Structure formats: C-alpha cells, structure tokens
Amino acid sequence: MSSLLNSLLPEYFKPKTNLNINSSRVQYGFNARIDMQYEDDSGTRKGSRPNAFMSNTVAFIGNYEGLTSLFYNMLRLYYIKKWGSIKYEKDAIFYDNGHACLLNRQLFPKSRDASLESSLSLPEAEIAMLDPGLEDVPAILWHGRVSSRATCILGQACSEFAPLAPFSIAHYSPQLTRKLFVNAPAGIEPSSGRYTHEDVKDAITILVSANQAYTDFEAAYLMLAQTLVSPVPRTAEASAWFINAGMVLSCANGYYPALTNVNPYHLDTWKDTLNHWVAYPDMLFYHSVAMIESCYVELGNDLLVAMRTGREISTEIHVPVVVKDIDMPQYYNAIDKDVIEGQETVIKVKQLPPAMYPIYTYGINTTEYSDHFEDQVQNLSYKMTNFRAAMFSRNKPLYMTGGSVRTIATGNYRDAAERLRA
Amino acid sequence: MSSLLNSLLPEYFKPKTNLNINSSRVQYGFNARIDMQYEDDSGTRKGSRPNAFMSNTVAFIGNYEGIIVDDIPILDGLRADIFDTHGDLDMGLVEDALSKSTMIRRNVPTYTAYASELLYKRNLTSLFYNMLRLYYIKKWGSIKYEKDAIFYDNGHACLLNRQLFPKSRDASLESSLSLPEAEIAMLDPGLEFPEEDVPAILWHGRVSSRATCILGQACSEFAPLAPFSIAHYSPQLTRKLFVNAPAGIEPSSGRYTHEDVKDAITILVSANQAYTDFEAAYLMLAQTLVSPVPRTAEASAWFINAGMVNMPTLSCANGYYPALTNVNPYHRLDTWKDTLNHWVAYPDMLFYHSVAMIESCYVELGNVARVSDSDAINKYTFTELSVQGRPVMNRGIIVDLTLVAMRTGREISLPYPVSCGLTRTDALLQGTEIHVPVVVKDIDMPQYYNAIDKDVIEGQETVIKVKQLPPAMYPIYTYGINTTEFYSDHFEDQVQVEMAPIDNGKAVFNDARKFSKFMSIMRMMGNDVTATDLVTGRKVSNWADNSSGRFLYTDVKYEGQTAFLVDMDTVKARDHCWVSIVDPNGTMNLSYKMTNFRAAMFSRNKPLYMTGG
Amino acid sequence: MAPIDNGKAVFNDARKFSKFMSIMRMMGNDVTATDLVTGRKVSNWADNSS
C-alpha cells in the first residue's frame, strides 16, 4: 500500500528515484538548527547550535523463519540480484558504546562469512505445461510464450530458501509447491540457469496482468516492508528484541480461464501499488525504514502505525555481551560483579527499552520522548528550524542519484456513480 | 445461505481467499488494548496491556452418526409452464408438455400415469453434502489424529482422546476412509416402465473418467477409523444411480484431485437446475465441519453421546422426464443462485462461516440452560414460538437458525422449510446427570470439581457429576453486539467492593452479580484469587481457563446460597503485565477499557496468516 | 526522568534539588546524594527538630 507508507515520510523530504546501497548499515537523520535561551536566579544567557545531527542506524541483518506468497519470493529474488555485493563478516561489531560490546558471533550462531549472492544456492521446481483437454498443484495464466529466463525465476521462487549468513531478504522459507502448471497457448522453453535483476521485473509485470492479481501484490509489498530492514539497537539493553527468531499457494485460473475476463470485480485505487513499484523500485527502502521506525517507537510506550500517526488506516531476557572496560559491572546489571577486559558475561533486561528514537515521525504527535519543535522546560526555551535530510553509509555521505519522483495516484471514482459503501 | 452467515462476521474482520490449515486445532480470536485501573483511599495504580489475546480453541474432531429420514420435496428447478397460479404441479399441463416433446410415442401413456408419484421425488441435498465432504478430505488430507493426545487439560483435571472416543486408531484424514464405489449405469431412453427406488440424474455432454469415480464414492457408506468431523459415519445413500447422458459413461479412473470434485458439482447443479438443494447442503456442512474444544473440564458433557445427523433420502426423477427441465425454471426468491456462486469463487470461506455458526449456537445454549421449566419460553418450547412456517419436524437446521436469530436479534428467512442437518440440543432436553471421565494430575482435585471419590491418588481414572451444562464457548465474533449481564462482554465496566479498616482484608460477597465481575477483572490484572463458600465449604478459583481469561458464575459448579469469603492477603501475582494489590485499605474501585480490535489466528503455537486475494 | 534511565537522576538546578530532598524527609525517606565534581556526599536527615 504505497499511498499509506508514502504519507509517513516528513513533508520537507521528497526522495529521488535511485539509491546505490553498498553496505549492510545505513544512518538516516536530519541537520537541524537549535536556538536555546537560558534564565535562572544568577542571570540570563543566550546561545545557538548551528548544526546538530540527530539520526538512527538501520541494518540488513535479522534472524527470521517462515498468490501473495509467490510475489513475496519473486520480490526477494529481485533485491538479492540488485544489492548482491553486501558482505557479512562474523567477527564484526553489532553494538559498541565503550564499556560493553556485542559481536555477530553472539546473537547469530550457526553462521559463516559470505556475500548476499553467495548466501543462497536455490534449486528449481518442475514448471510443467497444462495441455487444454485435461478434465495440491496451482495453475497460472501467461501472456504469449514463457521466456527461457521466466522459467528459471518461477522455478526458484517456489523452491526452499536455506541461507548461510543471516540476511533480512534471504530468511529461511519452507517449499511453496512441488509442481506449477502454466496455461500458455505457446509451449514453455527449458530453464536457462542465469537471469539479471531486470528479467525479474518482466516476470512480475506479466504474471500480475494475466491473472489480474493486483491486490495479491499489495499484500506482498507491505509484507516485505516489515522484513527488508531491521533496527540497530539504541542501547545494549535494546538487543533483547532480536534474540528469539520472529515467525513470518493455491490458484485455479489456469484450469478455468472463463472466470477471469475483461470486467474484473474490485477500491478504485486497486492498481496503484504495482504502478508505484514498477516505476520506482528503490523507493521500498524509504517506506520500510518509515514502517519499522513507527512500530519500534510505539512499542516503547504492525498496522501500531495508527497509534503513532493518529489516523484511521483501512521473564527477564539474558543478552550475551563482551567486557571492554574493567568498570562495566557499575553501569550494566551484570551477573558477575568482578570482570576482566576480554571476558564474555551476560546482562539482565526486565523491561524492554525503546530500540529507536523518532526521526521521520518527529513532532507529528508529541508525548512527554519530548520531541517538540518549541518547548519551555522549567528555564530553557529552544526553537528547532532549517531541517534537511542526510544519509551516511560506511562513515561517508550516501547521495541519492537519478531524477525527481513525479506523483502517480488515482481518484476515488473512475466512472462510478454511487459509493456502495460495502 | 452465504448472505446470512456473512453478516455474523465482525466489522474489523477483513477475510482473504486462501487459508493454509496444517493441523487439527485453531485458536481464532482478536488482539485488544486493555487500560486497567485500581482506585483506593491510599491512591490509584494504573496498568496497560497493549496486546491482550482472547481466544476460542476449535478442533476438526467430533463423534457424529448419519440416519436417512423422509423430508419435503424442493420444487425449484422444474419449468414454470406446468405450475398453476397457487404454485403446485397442475397435472394435465404435465401430460400436455410430455405430448409436445421429443419422447417415444408408445411411452407417453405409461410414463404420464407414474408422474403423480415420481415428480414429487426431488431432493439432491444428500448427494451434494457427500461431494462437498470429498472436496475438503482431499484438500486438508495431511492433518493427523494421535490416540494418546490431550483433548483438554486445566492443571487439576486432564481428559484424553482415548476416554471420549474408544474403537479409535491413530491415522491421517486421507488414510481414514476407504470408500467402495457404487455402480453408475447408463439410462436406456427406450425403457418400458420407470424403475422407482432408483434415482436418475441429468448431465451435460459426456461423463468424464474422474466424474464416475466421484459420483461412485459419494453414493457409498462412510466407515471411518479416526473420529474426524468431515469423515463421520453415513449410511449407503443408494446401490445403483442412472445418468441420462447420450454420450456414454467412461469407466472409473480410480484417482482424482480436489479440483475435479468442483468440476463434478458445477455440471450437476447446472444440468438438474438444483441451486436450493445446494444451499441446504452448504448450511448442513457449516454446522458439522468443526466442533469446539470445551472451555472448562465439566463442559465436555455436550460431546459424550453422539449427536444424530438427519440426511434426507436421495430421490431424483429428472432422467425419466428430460422435457420438464429447460432454461426458464420456476424459483421463489430471485437471489437463488447466490450460495453456489459464492462457494465456487471462495471455497475456503466456509471455515469462517462454520466457526461463526457454532459460536452463535453454543453461546445461546449457555444462557438457555439457566432458565426454570416453569416459564413461557423455556428449554423445551423455545423453537415452536420462534418458527412461523410449516416444517415436518423441529430438528436439524431449524433449531440452529432460531438460536442465531436470538443471538444477532434479526429475522432469518429461508425459501423452503427444510429440516435436515445436526441436532445439538440433545444432552439439554434429557435433563439428567452426565458422567464425564477424567484422569487426575494433583491429589487435591475433589474439593474444586464435584468428583465421585473424595481421596484419589495421581494417575487414577475418576468421574465428575455435571448437573447444569456450563457454556462451551465464550462470545468473541459476537462481542458487544447483543450484550447480556451473564457473560459481561462490555467495552467499559466497573465494580465497587466496600471494606472498612476494622476488617483485616476479609470481605464477604452477599451479592452474586458483583462477585462474578470482581473475580473476572482481577484475572485481567493477573491475580490468582481463591474464594471459599461459607455455607457448603467448597472452593472456587478465578483461574479456571487458559483461552478467554474471564470468570463466568457457572465455574462454582453448585447452585445454593451466596456467601463467598475472599481473603485479600493470599492474592498471588501469576501472569506478566499486571497491576499489584500489595495491601488495600477502604473501598476498592476496579475498571477497564477496550479501545481497538485486530483479528488474529494461532495454530501449532505459531501465527496462522490469511493469504490470497 | 525517562524509563531509559535506571532510577539515576542528575539535578543541574540547585533550587529544586533543595525542595526534592526536603519533601522526601516529610514522607520519611532517607535519601543520600553524591556530588559528581568534588566527590562528597549529603544526607537529607541532618536534623531531628524541624
């Protein structure tokens, strides 16, 4: 649902089409200007912070376990090929404050060092041809001849996902089906073996148009927006969220093509989400960051988004840590009260702290977070002005490429007279 | 009727097409945000549970037994010319219609004589019912039934599957039935005199190799091994079945998929013009698809003895008179094809329509069992006053539809007064004690439950005496649409327990109504309260359920005088996300508020997500 | 105070520190603050009359 998740972004920020992600970590924030004014019994003092950077950190690492299910896997195959040069190192840092530290050995055991393209080695399910005359296997329609490349994509989309490195868009999924019939007038070609990320777009665009499965795609689009990215915790205690692994196909169009005709039953804005994705594929990154922020902010106090925006949408946990400084037990609630630099201990977390601070959803509705533009704390009176979005990746500025995003959106009526509420 | 069963579903519930069931147990419910408050002379203590799950466990097991009964004929389908002004077969127009047709001239006089008996044999409900069961057996065939599995467990008492269902071997649903095939002969158009007690059906073109295998198994005895709900015992519908198909019947294939059964149904309804027959079969299966897992241990009295399913005798004489069925049929209601068109589009929607119907019935039978016989509308005479038609016998669908009418508070209308399906009100009307078996876990059981023995060592098989039937399900889909004070399913509620400092925590509830609300709200707050009756000397615990998380007054398991001593220095904090009552002094005021609702389903202790369009 | 802080509060203002420590003594609570700059300690229970 593009129009829903597009609304979550702040009014000042309008992102460009393309975004060349070249790492497993992205900072996002804004550069604001603060004008403080202090008053007490001694006297008055006036200052000004010219440039202040408030940002969260989001990563592509999250332990998860598994026609909406078919489109979900087809979308995951698109982004594996596109961003297929991201490196996961096992002996890297996850959180680092100065006193304590979490490595990727901890939180993710049964893992090795691999690139995203090298993570999965997918097998291929049998894509058979449905001969017209035949009186737990789905059958799908297709436009013209099934291309040699289109066969390999449908074959791998239905197969089991068995990853080596923990990646968000390569999580473990069970086998969808064994066979998949395709009612194509012209016979299908044998599987090639190789395909480009551009070829997966052509496969999705044909599969939706033939089957009229536009609402099925909208479900899969929202379903990926949750998984795509995971938060890097604000403090060491906020790692308690990501210890335990969070839990994440039938069709009869091929058999009876008479039921699907030129006058389909449908909201009038039922083809907007596909038309948005096919135009701007890389926009999903911004919609994903907007969604997971809204959820993890409100849980501090999924569609939690209503509670955040305020609009109608239609046991103690044992975090394993590493000791960096000798004075660690004074700060953190550690088991062993005497430690040495290098020792692996465990800290206790009873109440779950906030994993993220409001950045995109800053001042849309202010709770006493205290994320005001103007506020008088009792005396300190500050004003925030001149907001401008900035993204950092691998300790350098990450710049947006391509042109400006023009709006695509359909009205409530095409040629419909009465709103049959339903 | 798809229309009336659709309206029962909640407003917030937005269903999708596909539902991937992979187990014989589903916890349907909703997630709500409860803002609890405890006010006192000392001060106020506020709590908030952001995700509170209220569930009703529903299984795919339940003992049923089919019997062949005589039911009214359904006259929808026959041509509109032969009917008179009043709406009954005017014989004389039938003889006129047969004469001006493509019939053999020597058969006209002999066939017309038989018409008086054979034309009033129109009821295909039994055939469609069996063919619908074959669709779901092959679709959800991978679900398993273990013999030594836990039917119910509440910590104190345990009830196994061996106890309720003897003669039961462990097997998958696909491997349960071994259906033998009935003979599907071809009707000779040049037959001298029609053979009554043998039904003859119509068909479009050629009977396919798979259609023979489906019709063969549909008209046969169901002899199951495992007690499944969609594979219950049914008698042999018929021995032989004629099919008037000029294109010859192909021999039996042997194998078929679930998609081939949909092909067989759509041809049969279209050829015979039997849409009202299908509507009856759809409502029949809606009752007997899923049975509820009992809320309490003593709520198993409903499922001890097998409830009888009333299947109307298979009788059809369309094969002998092809001329009388054409493209201009007689129908009472204009929306007579709506039920079939709904099933063909969304087959898996029946699961949601089924749970909606059983939840509506078992909720109303809960608060019907608690009325005295000396009254106008009572246990025995609640069906007669409601029904404003002329059914043969008040059984099957009439008793279930009248309970739904009481729940929602609307007028349910059917085109024909058909009396077929499961009869639930069996254990109620008997009005006797029921002896449910139980295997004990602890040694201090018979204080709580009305047991037969007073001292019982752990692992012993005992018996509980249930007199008044407690509610089997709590209202979840029908939550706060037609609210009663018994269930107390309000959005906002409060209770005022009045105590003085001279009393050292000990409060006596003279009133029965506010005792129920106190014990219920304390369980939302996650507090284990244990009251003791002063007159009798028995004990009751608010923690008597692990699904809904509410306290109904029927958990006392005794009707007498009300004098409940609750000691408020033995209250123990059990659950997480809880408000603490450390040491109260003065008047207590408890209150809660449910704000928003989100549909959620669980299976195998994992979330079950809805997929498709 | 915010929930992220595990009970620990720093009083930048001197005026409201005095009122907090005084009202806590009316309520019969023995509070012991520690100065971060110098490293000395102060106790609100420093009198048995007023």
Short mmCIF file of C-alpha atoms in Angstrom, two decimals, chain A residues 67-68 135 215-216, chain B residues 258 260 611-613:
data_model
loop_
_atom_site.label_atom_id
_atom_site.label_comp_id
_atom_site.label_asym_id
_atom_site.label_seq_id
_atom_site.Cartn_x
_atom_site.Cartn_y
_atom_site.Cartn_z
CA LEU A 67 -0.72 -15.57 -4.89
CA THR A 68 0.82 -13.33 -2.11
CA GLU A 135 -10.89 -32.75 -17.27
CA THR A 215 -4.44 -6.86 -4.55
CA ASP A 216 -2.31 -10.06 -4.02
CA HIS B 258 -9.89 -31.75 -5.10
CA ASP B 260 -12.03 -32.41 -10.13
CA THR B 611 -3.14 -15.20 2.11
CA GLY B 612 -4.57 -14.70 -1.45
CA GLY B 613 -6.92 -12.03 -2.92
#
